[PDB]
Write a protein that binds this ligand. Structure first.
Ligand SMILES: CCCCCCCCCCCCCCCC(=O)OC[C@H](COP(=O)(O)OC[C@@H](O)CO)OC(=O)CCCCCCCCCCCCCCC
Ligand SMILES: CCCCCCCCCCCCCCCC(=O)OC[C@H](COP(=O)(O)OC[C@@H](O)CO)OC(=O)CCCCCCCCCCCCCCC
Ligand SMILES: CCCCCCCCCCCCCCCC(=O)OC[C@H](COP(=O)(O)OC[C@@H](O)CO)OC(=O)CCCCCCCCCCCCCCC
Ligand SMILES: CCCCCCCCCCCCCCCC(=O)OC[C@H](COP(=O)(O)OC[C@@H](O)CO)OC(=O)CCCCCCCCCCCCCCC
Ligand SMILES: CCCCCCCCCCCCCCCC(=O)OC[C@H](COP(=O)(O)OC[C@@H](O)CO)OC(=O)CCCCCCCCCCCCCCC
Ligand SMILES: CCCCCCCCCCCCCCCC(=O)OC[C@H](COP(=O)(O)OC[C@@H](O)CO)OC(=O)CCCCCCCCCCCCCCC
Ligand SMILES: CCCCCCCCCCCCCCCC(=O)OC[C@H](COP(=O)(O)OC[C@@H](O)CO)OC(=O)CCCCCCCCCCCCCCC
Ligand SMILES: CCCCCCCCCCCCCCCC(=O)OC[C@H](COP(=O)(O)OC[C@@H](O)CO)OC(=O)CCCCCCCCCCCCCCC
Ligand SMILES: CCCCCCCCCCCCCCCC(=O)OC[C@H](COP(=O)(O)OC[C@@H](O)CO)OC(=O)CCCCCCCCCCCCCCC
Ligand SMILES: CCCCCCCCCCCCCCCC(=O)OC[C@H](COP(=O)(O)OC[C@@H](O)CO)OC(=O)CCCCCCCCCCCCCCC
Ligand SMILES: CCCCCCCCCCCCCCCC(=O)OC[C@H](COP(=O)(O)OC[C@@H](O)CO)OC(=O)CCCCCCCCCCCCCCC
Ligand SMILES: CCCCCCCCCCCCCCCC(=O)OC[C@H](COP(=O)(O)OC[C@@H](O)CO)OC(=O)CCCCCCCCCCCCCCC
Ligand SMILES: CCCCCCCCCCCCCCCC(=O)OC[C@H](COP(=O)(O)OC[C@@H](O)CO)OC(=O)CCCCCCCCCCCCCCC
Lengths: 69, 69, 69, 69, 69, 69, 69, 69, 69, 69, 69, 69, 69, 69, 69, 69, 69, 69, 69, 69
């Protein structure tokens, strides 16, 4: 596909925000949820799953660009 | 079918935008939704389904052209 | 029925446009809707239903000609 | 009733046009409407109802002739 | 009443035309309207009502003769 | 009530058509709807309700004659 | 009130037709509507309401005579 | 009831299409839905219910003919 | 039933696609789901159920043809 | 069945991804889960079951192709 | 209240039909629903509730007469 | 207020009919609706609400007379 | 304002009829409507609103006299 | 109550069908469900409950007749 | 009860399929489940319970016929 | 509060029916539910809770009168 | 409380049925459940609890009458 | 605010009826609902919530007067 | 703005009635609605929202005067 | 209690089946379980407990009749 056009700026902002401030805010919310739900039932596997989801988010732009040429 | 005509330009723009900037914006929205809904209930299967839907989108033009000759 | 007459050209244009540029535009809109509504609730069954509807559209001329002789 | 008279030609043209070019144009419009309204809410039952209405149209001449002798 | 007189021929022509060519033309117009209005909102009940009205038309002469002796 | 009169033929045709060709067409439409809506949500209770409604239709003439003497 | 007079015959015909051929035709139309609208949404309560309305029609003459002495 | 009349052809086409091409298309859609919904939650009971509904469809003509004489 | 008609091509495409590319895609999705849900709770019985459902899909055309003659 | 068609590319990508990068990611997640759940309750049988599931995944394409011709 | 009047016959028919043929039909429908919904989830408590509702129906006339003098 | 006047007879008839034949007919319709809607979803609370509404109807004359002196 | 004059008698009759026979007839109609609409959807809140409206009607003369001196 | 009337035939058919072909079909569906749900979790108590429900169905006519005189 | 009627063929097919191919498929699924769940926890009592359930299935037709005359 | 007024009779009937026939019917339904749900899972604590709820019902009038003066 | 009224017959039937045929049926179901669940895990304490629950049922009328005066 | 005026009587009646006969009727309905919904699922917490709501109702006049001076 | 003028008296009356008798009547209606809708679904949050709305009403004059100088 | 009524036949069948064929089947299942569980851990006390439970079953009718008069 083409990264430019009328919607090039919107796509660019979304791609940078995936690993930018909004993505970091979502990751921090994930860490907060993992810590909070571990008060009654301590489960560190959710931390591993959250780290995997951050890894997926960091590669979201590459995945989208590879699927949508 | 015929790709040209009075509506040839509209169809061409839609076909390029399917894998272009609007399609990439929709894919980024999918990734954002997957990350956000994983804050409380981490589910990486939704990431696989989203990747499958991006794969479907990348082949949307071929599917439409094959069905509608 | 008879394919010719005073309205033969209008019917011919409609039949070609069913699988032509307007039909392809409608199919692309279907794919866009499937991708967009899958952002919050990923549902790939709607993709199958859309493909079935494109298959119905590709056979619309034959169906109309068979019903209306 | 009698198929001939001063209005025999008008009735003949209407009867042939029911399954002719105008009837086929209306059927194609039905298919276009079914495809278009299925973009947001895919509903293939409307396709079945449209096919039933084409079947009714194909038998319109027989029905009218049977009711009006 | 009496079927003959100065207006016997006019009444005779009207009675035959009720189920004749003009009545059949009106019935065909009813079928065309049912098909056309079903493009956007498919409603096969209007077909049943139209068939009932053709049935009423086929019995119009008997009804008029029974009411007006 | 009286089954004859100016409207005796219309009532007779309606009574025979209740269990005749139009009634059978409506019953077949009921079966088609039951089969179609069972694609996504299989529900065989609707088949029982449809059979009950066909049973009601088969007794419609008797019910109308008993209520309207 | 008085059942006779200049309009005695019209009132008599209306009273007999309430439970006669026209009333039976209206009841058959009610049954047809109940069957038809039950194709997509099977609802047998409408059958009960229709039977109640036929019961009201069968007692229409008595009600009118009691209210209008 | 009577299988013939003005609507004899429509009823005949509906009866053959119940077990014909449209009925087979609906059955194939049922199988596709059963396979698709079994991706996340494998449930082979829905296959049995679908087979029962195909069995009901195969006997739809007999049921309608028995109920509506 | 009859495999041909106005909807013969749609039924043919559906029957081939049941064991064709779309059916294989659904089967691959089943395998992916079995593998993914086995990360936390390894259950190889779901693999057996998925294989049984693929076996059912491979025989879907025969089942539909036997039920709907 | 046929490996080609409008959905040939999607099926091809799914088949390669079953033993490709996504399949390897799922297998690595299986190994991570086996290691993590063995911290408190060391169970090496889950490792054997995970290896069996990887063996099933490696043969998923052959199984799907054999079941769906 | 008074059981007679212009609406005495309608009320009488309704009161007898509460425990008559229509009431028995509704009770049989209740039993059919209890049996059908017990295929997947056998629940005999619904049978007890249905029997209680039949008991309420059998006393409906007395309740209505006591409340409405 | 005053119970007499030009509209004294109409008000008297309405007051007696509230607990008379029309009120009893409405109560019987309430019982029929409660029984019918309990076929699929047995709910005896609606019976209690209906009994409360009959109790309200039995006291309607007193309430109206107290509010409107 | 002044209660007397050329229109003093009309205003007096209207004021007495607000809580007199016509007002009571309207209140009875309100109760009948509440009972009737509660057959299918039992809603006793409408009874409370109707009682409030009767309370408003009982104070209509005082309100009108206070606003219009 | 009375077994005859306008709805006598419908009630008769329902009563015979309770223990007739439809009742036997529902019982066979119960047995099929008991066998199917016993594949993973063998529970023969559901067979006893199903037999009890068939016993209830066999006595449904007597129960309805006793409750509704 | 009566084995014939409009639903005689459906009941006949269900009765033969109880001990026919679908019943044998369910029994084979039972044996597969018994073998599979015995990999980790060998329990041959489940085999006895499965054999008892096959014995119940073989007598399902007799039980249903005895309960529902 | 005041026990009298336009709604004094309705409140009186409700207060007596709380410990009267309807309250006793609800208590008997509670006992029936306790007995029925104890067939599979015998739990006599529900009997104690039901007795406590009957005790609450017996004191409902006093509680309502104390709260609402 | 009062044992009579509009709901006196319903309460009477419920009270007799508590220790009558339905109560005995529930007790027999309790004994059947005790015997069945004792096949794998023989527990005669459940028999004692069931006997206690039958004793509670036999005194249900007295308990309800004492609590609800 | 001011308690008097054109609407002083309506407000006075509403304030007394909040803790008067209508308020007591609503409280009795609350108790009836608590008792009825406790037949299947005994929950005495709803009784506490209902008592709290009666306490709120008893203080409704004071709350309204304090908020609206 | 200016509080005086031709419409000064109307505005003054509206401002006093906001917290006067009509405002108190509306607040009492709010409390009645909260109590009534809590019969089936007890929800004390609606009481808090109603109290907040009374607080808003008490400050309506100040808000309007501040916005409209 | 009373052994007769609407549920007299169901209770009679249950009472005879307690010591009839179903009771004997349950007893045989008890003996089979005792024999099977004695393969690894021979325990003849379970045989004594099973015999005691058969003795309880043989007296179930007398116990139920004595408790429920
Ligand atoms: C150029 C490409 C080929 C055409 C593709 C599209 C064809 C249009 C059908 C899809 C639109 C569906 C959604 C519409 C959205 C919509 O709301 O439409 C509104 C518009 C008005 O229809 P009705 O009068 O049914 O509507 C009443 C209200 O709904 C008004 O909104 O519908 C139509 O005009 C479409 C039906 C025309 C179909 C009949 C055409 C054949 C008749 C003429 C034959 C020639 C006469 C020659 C005389 C010389
Ligand atoms: C030929 C086969 C036998 C007829 C089968 C079908 C009968 C039609 C009933 C089913 C249609 C239901 C769904 C309709 C769908 C629908 O929307 O219909 C619309 C149409 C208009 O009805 P309304 O005026 O109630 O509608 C107002 C709006 O709803 C307009 O849409 O309804 C009718 O005409 C049906 C009622 C006729 C029933 C009364 C017939 C008896 C009166 C005439 C007696 C003879 C007079 C003789 C004078 C000489
Ligand atoms: C191209 C490949 C071959 C097609 C493969 C897939 C076929 C689709 C079935 C699987 C989808 C299941 C999951 C869907 C997910 C889903 O939620 O679907 C929603 C959509 C709407 O169905 P309903 O109206 O039952 O849904 C009501 C609500 O559930 C809306 O969500 O379902 C369908 O359209 C599928 C049924 C079509 C099956 C009937 C088709 C035959 C009728 C047309 C025959 C031709 C008419 C010709 C007229 C000219
Ligand atoms: C790019 C890498 C290759 C893809 C790898 C992953 C494939 C996805 C399967 C694993 C996900 C399993 C766990 C999901 C977690 C999950 O909860 O999923 C939820 C989502 C919704 O499924 P249902 O509608 O069954 O769910 C209803 C509720 O459960 C909603 O949560 O499931 C799917 O969409 C997966 C099934 C798609 C499988 C069918 C795909 C083939 C149909 C489309 C064929 C093409 C149509 C073309 C039209 C033009
Ligand atoms: C950053 C370090 C490298 C990652 C290390 C850890 C990887 C995580 C595995 C260990 C966690 C095990 C204990 C978890 C504790 C736990 O309870 O987890 C719960 C969570 C939800 O899983 P299920 O849906 O099976 O759970 C249903 C219920 O159990 C919910 O609790 O499990 C997972 O998400 C782990 C499986 C992901 C494994 C599949 C990953 C590959 C799919 C995505 C591939 C990319 C898609 C790209 C799309 C663009
Ligand atoms: C032919 C064989 C004998 C019939 C056997 C089956 C009878 C049907 C009962 C079992 C279905 C249960 C599962 C349904 C599945 C289901 O969801 O049904 C939906 C359908 C609609 O019912 P509701 O309006 O309660 O439903 C509202 C929503 O739930 C819509 O889904 O239910 C009924 O129609 C069944 C109740 C009819 C029972 C009353 C019949 C007596 C009234 C008519 C008497 C004659 C009137 C004559 C007028 C002239
Ligand atoms: C004979 C038995 C005793 C009567 C029992 C029933 C009374 C009717 C109330 C229940 C019907 C409710 C459901 C209706 C269904 C319905 O849709 O009705 C429609 C009809 C029209 O009312 P609206 O003009 O409010 O309706 C506008 C649109 O909704 C049209 O549909 O409503 C009325 O006429 C009922 C109100 C009359 C109530 C006022 C009567 C007192 C005024 C006359 C006093 C005497 C004047 C004497 C002048 C000389
Ligand atoms: C072709 C082979 C012979 C059929 C074998 C299998 C029969 C099916 C029973 C086993 C499935 C059990 C596991 C299902 C898994 C499951 O979840 O099913 C879901 C589906 C929906 O049932 P419900 O409405 O009880 O479900 C509500 C929710 O649970 C939805 O999931 O259940 C049925 O349809 C089965 C009951 C049909 C049994 C009644 C059939 C007789 C009624 C029709 C008689 C003819 C009417 C003719 C009208 C013209
Ligand atoms: C290809 C090789 C041959 C197949 C070998 C394996 C067969 C599967 C049995 C072993 C799995 C046992 C462990 C499963 C692990 C497991 O948890 O399974 C879960 C899955 C769902 O079963 P239920 O609905 O009982 O489960 C409810 C919950 O337990 C969900 O987990 O069980 C089945 O689907 C197996 C039963 C199918 C057996 C009936 C098959 C016959 C019905 C279809 C006949 C054809 C219909 C045709 C319609 C056109
Ligand atoms: C004929 C023999 C004597 C009756 C014996 C059995 C009585 C029924 C109680 C046992 C069933 C328990 C297991 C049910 C299984 C079950 O799930 O039931 C479901 C059904 C619905 O109750 P809910 O609305 O609490 O349920 C909401 C959801 O749980 C729906 O499932 O429960 C009832 O109807 C039983 C409560 C009625 C008890 C109150 C009756 C008194 C009110 C009527 C008084 C007369 C009003 C007259 C108006 C004119
Ligand atoms: C005759 C025996 C004494 C009555 C005993 C039973 C009383 C009813 C309470 C128990 C039913 C609970 C389960 C219901 C099951 C149920 O779903 O009910 C549905 C029905 C509708 O209530 P809602 O509007 O809250 O429901 C909205 C949706 O839930 C609709 O389903 O609820 C009521 O009508 C009960 C509340 C009435 C309580 C307020 C009565 C006082 C207001 C009237 C005062 C007199 C006005 C006089 C004006 C002139
Ligand atoms: C008549 C003899 C004197 C009563 C003796 C027995 C008292 C009951 C306590 C023992 C039962 C324990 C085993 C139960 C077995 C059991 O499973 O119970 C289930 C039932 C439901 O409780 P939960 O909501 O905690 O249960 C949630 C799930 O566990 C449902 O099973 O528990 C209760 O209702 C008992 C608690 C009531 C205790 C609070 C009562 C005081 C509140 C009401 C005060 C009056 C309000 C008046 C409003 C107007
Ligand atoms: C009269 C004796 C003193 C009261 C004692 C009991 C107080 C109630 C608390 C215990 C019940 C706990 C178990 C309940 C069982 C239960 O399931 O309750 C259900 C009910 C609904 O609560 P939710 O909306 O959280 O529930 C949503 C779903 O769970 C519905 O079931 O809970 C409440 O209403 C209790 C919370 C009220 C607590 C807040 C009260 C303060 C707000 C009002 C302040 C005044 C407003 C004035 C406006 C003018």
């Amino acid at each position: 596909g083409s990264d430019d056009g009328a919607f090039g700026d919107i796509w660019a902002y979304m791609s940078e925000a995936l690993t930018g401030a909004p993505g970091k805010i979502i990751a921090c919310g994930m860490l907060f949820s993992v810590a909070y739900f571990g008060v009654v039932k301590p489960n560190l596997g959710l931390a591993l799953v959250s780290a995997l989801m951050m890894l997926v988010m960091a590669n979201g732009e590459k995945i989208i660009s590879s699927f949508l040429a």
